[PDB]
Design an enzyme around this catalytic site. Sequence first.
Site, PDB file in Angstrom:
ATOM      1  N   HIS A  39      90.916 -17.523 125.223  1.00 11.73           N
ATOM      2  CA  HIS A  39      91.088 -17.213 123.803  1.00 11.73           C
ATOM      3  C   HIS A  39      92.494 -16.689 123.519  1.00 11.73           C
ATOM      4  CE1 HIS A  39      89.892 -13.184 125.314  1.00 11.73           C
ATOM      5  NE2 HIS A  39      90.511 -12.692 124.253  1.00 11.73           N
ATOM      6  N   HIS A  99      94.161 -14.138 122.360  1.00 13.63           N
ATOM      7  CA  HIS A  99      94.617 -12.749 122.253  1.00 13.63           C
ATOM      8  C   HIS A  99      95.850 -12.517 123.125  1.00 13.63           C
ATOM      9  CE1 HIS A  99      90.654 -10.808 120.613  1.00 13.63           C
ATOM     10  NE2 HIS A  99      91.457 -11.230 119.648  1.00 13.63           N
ATOM     11  N   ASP A 106      96.619 -10.593 125.462  1.00 20.70           N
ATOM     12  CA  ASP A 106      96.549 -10.355 126.899  1.00 20.70           C
ATOM     13  C   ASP A 106      96.096 -11.581 127.682  1.00 20.70           C
ATOM     14  OD1 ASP A 106      94.087  -9.957 125.620  1.00 20.70           O
ATOM     15  OD2 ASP A 106      93.366  -8.641 127.238  1.00 20.70           O
ATOM     16  N   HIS A 107      95.951 -12.719 127.001  1.00 16.40           N
ATOM     17  CA  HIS A 107      95.629 -13.962 127.692  1.00 16.40           C
ATOM     18  C   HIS A 107      96.556 -15.116 127.292  1.00 16.40           C
ATOM     19  CE1 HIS A 107      92.169 -11.694 129.003  1.00 16.40           C
ATOM     20  NE2 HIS A 107      91.886 -11.436 127.737  1.00 16.40           N
ATOM     21  N   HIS A 125      83.813 -13.472 120.746  1.00 19.42           N
ATOM     22  CA  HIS A 125      84.929 -12.578 121.006  1.00 19.42           C
ATOM     23  C   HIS A 125      86.139 -12.943 120.135  1.00 19.42           C
ATOM     24  CE1 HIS A 125      87.326  -9.701 123.291  1.00 19.42           C
ATOM     25  NE2 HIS A 125      88.284 -10.604 123.225  1.00 19.42           N
ATOM     26  N   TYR A 142      84.101  -3.914 117.626  1.00 21.95           N
ATOM     27  CA  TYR A 142      83.834  -4.828 116.518  1.00 21.95           C
ATOM     28  C   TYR A 142      82.735  -4.309 115.590  1.00 21.95           C
ATOM     29  CZ  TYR A 142      86.295  -8.642 119.034  1.00 21.95           C
ATOM     30  OH  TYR A 142      87.220  -9.439 119.682  1.00 21.95           O
ATOM     31  N   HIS A 148      89.199 -11.359 132.291  1.00 25.66           N
ATOM     32  CA  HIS A 148      89.263 -10.075 132.991  1.00 25.66           C
ATOM     33  C   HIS A 148      88.351 -10.187 134.201  1.00 25.66           C
ATOM     34  CE1 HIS A 148      91.387  -7.981 129.688  1.00 25.66           C
ATOM     35  NE2 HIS A 148      90.713  -8.831 128.936  1.00 25.66           N
TER      36      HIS A 148
HETATM   37  O1  LIG Z   1      90.690  -4.076 125.263  1.00 25.08           O
HETATM   38  C1  LIG Z   1      90.193  -3.727 124.174  1.00 25.08           C
HETATM   39  O2  LIG Z   1      89.412  -2.811 123.874  1.00 25.08           O
HETATM   40  C2  LIG Z   1      90.627  -4.529 122.950  1.00 25.08           C
HETATM   41  C3  LIG Z   1      91.494  -3.659 122.048  1.00 25.08           C
HETATM   42  S1  LIG Z   1      92.775  -4.731 121.368  1.00 25.08           S
HETATM   43  C4  LIG Z   1      92.424  -6.116 122.509  1.00 25.08           C
HETATM   44  C5  LIG Z   1      91.891  -7.343 121.764  1.00 25.08           C
HETATM   45  S2  LIG Z   1      90.266  -7.701 122.433  1.00 25.08           S
HETATM   46  C6  LIG Z   1      90.646  -6.797 123.932  1.00 25.08           C
HETATM   47  C7  LIG Z   1      91.546  -7.689 124.769  1.00 25.08           C
HETATM   48  S3  LIG Z   1      90.648  -9.143 125.332  1.00 25.08           S
HETATM   49  N1  LIG Z   1      91.372  -5.688 123.392  1.00 25.08           N
HETATM   50 ZN   LIG Z   2      90.348 -10.725 123.596  1.00 27.75          ZN
HETATM   51 ZN   LIG Z   3      91.490  -9.587 127.139  1.00 26.92          ZN
END
Ligand SMILES: O=C(O)[C@H]1CS[C@@H]2CS[C@@H](CS)N12
Ligand SMILES: [Zn+2]
Ligand SMILES: [Zn+2]
Lengths: 266, 266, 266, 266
Positions: free
Chosen positions: B83, B85, B87-88, B159, B190, B224
Amino acid sequence: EVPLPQLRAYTVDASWLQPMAPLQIADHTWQIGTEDLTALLVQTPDGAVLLDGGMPQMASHLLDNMKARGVTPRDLRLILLSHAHADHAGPVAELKRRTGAKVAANAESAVLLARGGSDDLHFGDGITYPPANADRIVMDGEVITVGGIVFTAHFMAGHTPGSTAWTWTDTRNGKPVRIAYADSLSAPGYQLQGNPRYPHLIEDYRRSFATVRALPCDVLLTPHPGASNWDYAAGARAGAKALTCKAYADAAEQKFDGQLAKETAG
Amino acid sequence: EVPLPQLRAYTVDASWLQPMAPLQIADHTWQIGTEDLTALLVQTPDGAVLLDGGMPQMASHLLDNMKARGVTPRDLRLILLSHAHADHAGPVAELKRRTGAKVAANAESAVLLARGGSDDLHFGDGITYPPANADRIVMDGEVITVGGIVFTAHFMAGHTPGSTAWTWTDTRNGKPVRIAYADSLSAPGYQLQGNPRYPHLIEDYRRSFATVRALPCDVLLTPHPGASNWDYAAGARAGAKALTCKAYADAAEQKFDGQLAKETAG
Amino acid sequence: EVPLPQLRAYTVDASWLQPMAPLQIADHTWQIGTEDLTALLVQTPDGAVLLDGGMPQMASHLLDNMKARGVTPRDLRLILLSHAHADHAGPVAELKRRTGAKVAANAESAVLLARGGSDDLHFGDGITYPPANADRIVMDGEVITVGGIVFTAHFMAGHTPGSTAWTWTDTRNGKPVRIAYADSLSAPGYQLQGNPRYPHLIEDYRRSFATVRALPCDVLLTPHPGASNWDYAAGARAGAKALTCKAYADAAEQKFDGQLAKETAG
Amino acid sequence: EVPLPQLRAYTVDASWLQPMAPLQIADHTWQIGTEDLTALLVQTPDGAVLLDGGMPQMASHLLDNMKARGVTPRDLRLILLSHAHADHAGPVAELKRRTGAKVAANAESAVLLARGGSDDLHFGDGITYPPANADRIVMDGEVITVGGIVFTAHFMAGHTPGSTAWTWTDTRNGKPVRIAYADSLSAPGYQLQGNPRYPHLIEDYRRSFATVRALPCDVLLTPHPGASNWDYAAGARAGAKALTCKAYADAAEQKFDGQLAKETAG
Ligand SMILES: O=C(O)[C@H]1CS[C@@H]2CS[C@@H](CS)N12
Ligand SMILES: [Zn+2]
Ligand SMILES: [Zn+2]
Ligand SMILES: O=C(O)[C@H]1CS[C@@H]2CS[C@@H](CS)N12
Ligand SMILES: O=C(O)[C@H]1CS[C@@H]2CS[C@@H](CS)N12
Ligand SMILES: O=C(O)[C@H]1CS[C@@H]2CS[C@@H](CS)N12
Ligand SMILES: [Zn+2]
Ligand SMILES: [Zn+2]
Ligand SMILES: [Zn+2]
Ligand SMILES: [Zn+2]
Ligand SMILES: [Zn+2]
Ligand SMILES: [Zn+2]
């Protein structure tokens, strides 16, 4: 062992983020940004124009000041930009979502805006902001008219390839006031000579000094007010010390020449 | 008085940013990201595929690991995403600039990627990254074939609206290994019920648990690694404790049901 | 009573659509388009470059000729454009889908390409084609290097705002051959003076005549071969009558001056 | 020998292009398109909404009819779409240039609109139109409110991946009228089974019949009026023979089942 560094936020001087109430420049033109970032509201009988928005976190403050001026979100028709860096186009995406505003920009500013200031010629990904799309592409010298106020684009490439001065004629005391909103002429930490991402950088800056010098210019305003010696916190005297366009261009060229010499010596 | 707040960078746990050498999963499939963010390299006789890239600052590390694997920038043909976001998909724009890679994604992931993760349904502008364009739009169940390895898209919205599982068959010890790279099934902070930006959020998550449960799945991997009980730092035992797809989906649904109950009670 | 008119297709002279086998220009450079539309293939030890593609329906013919030259779809790395009109950028979207090619263009050409040639400054929506995205934005004078062949961009705005000449050095008989692929200098049916969509049109054309006149130019090629007196159907004598860059620029300027005079008289 | 074929324009039945004066459907809702293409104007105390625009050449006629209704270009706030084919989204780009309208669409419709209907899953590049950008992306079941009229999106993928029904409640004779503007449920010349570009096509159509059957639906309207048995030329009796949503869905499913059987037999 050692993790990759965390992302670093684009942080700025506190005064760049200090909200101020609207400051009138001429009969239809107001400064509605922060103490040290310009955002100009031009109000017409047929809607409002915003020139620059400042930093991304300034969107709600801008909307508050528009409301104070009698401008509802539906009334904001047009956003124009000096250049598409984070500290001037920052809130544009959010403003588009929350108002009726459409963006007009030249092609260079449009493509930089569309990638949220990422892959900057000089700053890489260090100064990104939410991306936005331009609704109208303008050419050099093109005019845009809103509620009878005519805005003319003057390209002045250098600080960014899409750097633009906007000019229009307002009134004060029954007399016309030719306002020039001239973009930045700085090159902060730029490699000036032999830059593979901007090979004609020096030629473009030199042309841009000449462009700014020749603008119709009873009153000069700049994205950073200090660059034209404006002091937005100084009330009735805010614009008293403002430079002419000629003086602004001359100072910028002298600084640029010094930077070129230092670069050669560096 | 009080300036607007500075922009805040998206900062993450150090282990998410801790580089690791390539870890082999099957004959053509390697983990080349960090200790706690998955980035899968699949190497074929006709070029390489990357599934996810992790955080924006991981681009150079990814390219280093590809080189270690014998994959030059020209050899990287395709980027797929779980997806979009930060971090990916963080380094996707830079990877596109520095390699021959083209991006394939569904429409939802493409539009989120194109705005650099800004205007997120849940996180607003808090997690932006450099925007990138998708080169190919894929539909649910569509296949993409590279060097004879067939990747199948399985949409699992929740997600993010564009969340996708990717499946393909590799080999190990002369036997086929059906690999499922399933996206996140979390909903971190969420609003689940009555969310005006995502009115069918709960229905989509429920369908997605069922989708993940039914995937072809000899080996489960997740963006993750902890979510599927992978430990990339544990060497020969990295995948020993990995969940099945059924167990991953069941755990996610039980957690989701708990979150729904807490939301009702909140 | 009377229905609105049917959409009208952009139709062209048959020779513009007449396929031809590859015609060698220099050791690495081939004409692979049609009899009357240029599409240049440059083959390097590290992949191929295509300069222009002609009309939209030419994609498969281009791919056939590349194959004849030993260039597979994966081997095509880069597409460059003279300008983003339908008869030169027509098949770009399809070529991107069917090959590994990425597009490099200036900002003006990129925004026109992205809207598929719609809202043309002069032709409105009369000449649309499938839109495509640019992967790399180039600046005036910027170089792009592929397999050791160096391509230099020379902006020559006028025919379109993004009109570009591309130059590179190939070899023939052990000697360097400086090839100039100069864009169109025509203004077919254009309003030249006082055009509100292109206020500096005349200044841009005049600068562009000067730019073309000064190009490194042992061999001139143009998007329409007739403009530089090439005859692709004439085999060993195809380039015998070709104009110099100086002669091409002088002819274009004389024609332009005549058109200006006729416009004043019209 | 033989030139490549000329481009072929997308031509349609004359009645699709036959202008008509505005035809009132309910207190705020008017048909302002042509005899055989729907374009719905909804007028509110806070601006107007347009649902579909018909063919590309219909832009000026639409603006004429809006003016007749008292809607100036600045008053048009929002454009919604059934689906992004040339005969329903055709004039959207031009309408955006000439009015204050912004486009709201789902992701699938947005990406198809952005490429001007090119690379269609079924029709290739045969039905292109000027591309436009969406200003707002909507999710299934999301509402958009204008001047107090609430529009709800109901995704009904099949005819295009982004096909959408829009519903809202108007009034007539002091009583509420639940209007359903349901998209096409046709599959004209589509490969239904085993389509590699749309593997779940049949499942999506079946779900979409069920979606349409269940819509809030006092009055059904469709992009092609004949599909719901509307006759826009029949004045006071234009909607007399209109199908219910249930009958429309049942007819479409029966036709679809017949097409599936013929495909198996073909
Ligand atoms: O890690 C988290 O709690 C949330 C806060 S902002 C970012 C977007 S969804 C996840 C990373 S997959 N993350
Ligand atoms: Zn995410
Ligand atoms: Zn993530
Ligand atoms: O302020 C500066 O020195 C530089 C560093 S990053 C950002 C882009 S150009 C200038 C803001 S106009 N600024
Ligand atoms: O050939 C021409 O006269 C014009 C009419 S429309 C199309 C755009 S500019 C030239 C093709 S380069 N051409
Ligand atoms: O009318 C038709 O048969 C097909 C042929 S191409 C165009 C796209 S789907 C339908 C218009 S809704 N139409
Ligand atoms: Zn700046
Ligand atoms: Zn600045
Ligand atoms: Zn042209
Ligand atoms: Zn041409
Ligand atoms: Zn259709
Ligand atoms: Zn239709």
